[PDB]
Structures are given as C-alpha cells and as structure tokens.
Amino acid sequence: KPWDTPQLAAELERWKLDGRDVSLLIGGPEGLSPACKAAAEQSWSLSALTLPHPLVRVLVAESLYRAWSITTNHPYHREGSMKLQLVAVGTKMPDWVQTGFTEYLRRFPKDMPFELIEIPAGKRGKNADIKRILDKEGEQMLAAAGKNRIVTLD
Amino acid sequence: WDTPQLAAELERWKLDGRDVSLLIGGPEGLSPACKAAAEQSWSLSALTLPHPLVRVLVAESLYRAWSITTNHPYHREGSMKLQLVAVGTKMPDWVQTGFTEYLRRFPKDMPFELIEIPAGKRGKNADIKRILDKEGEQMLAAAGKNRIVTLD
C-alpha cells in the first residue's frame, strides 16, 4: 500500500533527501504507454488502491440511480409504490465530495422513491469499546429501517 | 453486481411493494443484529473505484502525507517539487467541481501541481495503442527530466 499516510510520508521524505523533482504518472484506463513505463524509476500498483469506506455509500447511491434509471417502472401498489432507503454509517467524507454529493442526491428525479439516512459514526478513539460502538451503530441503523425489508452490503 | 442484475432486483422489489432498506455499516462492518435481520447480503468487494477518481485519491493521499510531515518540527529539508501527471478521464461534474475547489485550497507552500493530460477519444473503433502513445508523449513532456514514479 504505498498510499497509506505513513508509507507515503516516508517515501516523500526519502525523495526530498535525494533532491530531484518527482512526477507521479497515471495513465488512462487501459494503462500507460511503453515510453512512460520505460521512464519509471519506481512503480506502484493500483491493485493496492482500495475504495475508501466513506465513498462506499456514494458509489452505492450512484449504482442505485443507474439501475433505477433503466427500470421499466412497471408495478402499481394501492397502498403505495416501494420506497428505497440507503441507511449508512456516516463516516466522514473527504473534503472534495461533501457538497457535490448532497446536491447529486437532491437532483435525483422526484419519481425515484429514494432517501439516504446517515447514522452517526461511533467515536473511534483509544478508550471507546468497539463491540458497543458496532452494536450501537447497528441499533440506530435498524431503528431507521423500521419494518422495511433489510438488505445488507458488506 | 452489474447494473442489469441490480435493475432486475429493483423490479422484483417494486412488484412486492414493501419498502426496502439497504444497510452499510462503518469500516469495521455490520453488527450481529444487522446480519441477523438481513434477508439478503451483498458483497462490497463487487464495487470498484472508477478510473477518474484514481487521480483524486492520489492527490488527497499526497496532501495528507505532505500535511503530516510539515506539522513535524524535524523533517528533512529540500526544494523538491511534486507533480501529479494524470490523463484527465471525465469525472462526474459534481466530483470535478469539489475536486477543483479541494486543489484550490492546497497551501502555496505545498510544492505540488496536478497536470491533467487530455484523454484520447475512446469508443467503438478507437486506436488504443496510438491513444496511449499520444497520452504518454504529453505526460513525459509535462514531466521533463523529473524522476518518474508510475501508478498502474
């Protein structure tokens, strides 16, 4: 994981000692040209780059929009059409996504019966009980869901 | 799970009519009670990072690393600059705006720049070898004689 904060900080320090300027190159989806690969003095694998947890709920919302978009929208219910709720522990999102994501959800068409409910994340500090934190998150998630059908994503 | 597979599931839920909640836990995962409640459980391993977001995550990683180091009273000295040179595959507009604002807030003293290289036109008949060669020419031109680290 040459991306983890500690690992990357150490790498930056070693580069600074050397003193030459450094360019990190990312190609298009199909990869890098032979000339770029020939140039590399170090190479990191993107296979090591994992989706950060706060972005999971973002990608799920987008997946649901894409799937809902292609549906025929067919059935009718007297009581009411099915509503979809995404109930997610609200781990702090990166700065670059906050406002944009909320606005993205706001622009879901009125006819898509969807809402995101964010559950407070328990404090991940030294003297907080992990078992109780998970239990408490779960309690709130289930409370938000009420008697809805439950599908978990994990 | 492909968009078709998910769309089919949504259709089935609509026919049933009952409301559906999709539950995502914190990083450590789901509580036993959530797992016990689940009628179906889907894997997150199926969800992949979109290519356009790679340069976003890398820029954030570099900021975080630079930040932790500059907060230390005893870090190495040096005049080295960092350049992130990335093919500019189209991000969603809402991510793009947030990302540009994020870059705008990088402090002047962080010796960093993102150089985005125009993405060649992909699609049905695209000459991918030529597209990559051309992207690479521009990337290497941006980098000049810098030490190169590739991320692939």
Swiss-Prot record, chain A:
Q: Which organism is it from?
A: Escherichia coli (strain K12)
Q: Which gene encodes it?
A: rlmH
**For this protein, what is the EC number?**
2.1.1.177
Q: Which HAMAP family match?
A: 23SrRNA_methyltr_H (MF_00658)
Question: What protein name does the entry list?
Answer: Ribosomal RNA large subunit methyltransferase H
The record's annotation in InterPro entries points to: Alpha/beta_knot_MTases, RlmH-like, tRNA_m1G_MTases_N
Q: Note the Pfam families from the entry.
A: SPOUT_MTase
Q: In the record, what terms sit under GO molecular function?
A: protein homodimerization activity; ribosome binding; rRNA (pseudouridine-N3-)-methyltransferase activity
This chain's function reads: Specifically methylates the pseudouridine at position 1915 (m3Psi1915) in 23S rRNA. Specific for fully assembled 70S ribosomes.
User: Cellular component terms, GO, for this chain's entry?
Assistant: cytoplasm
Q: Is Oxidoreductase one of the keywords UniProt gives this record?
A: no
Gene Ontology biological process terms, A to Z: rRNA base methylation; rRNA methylation
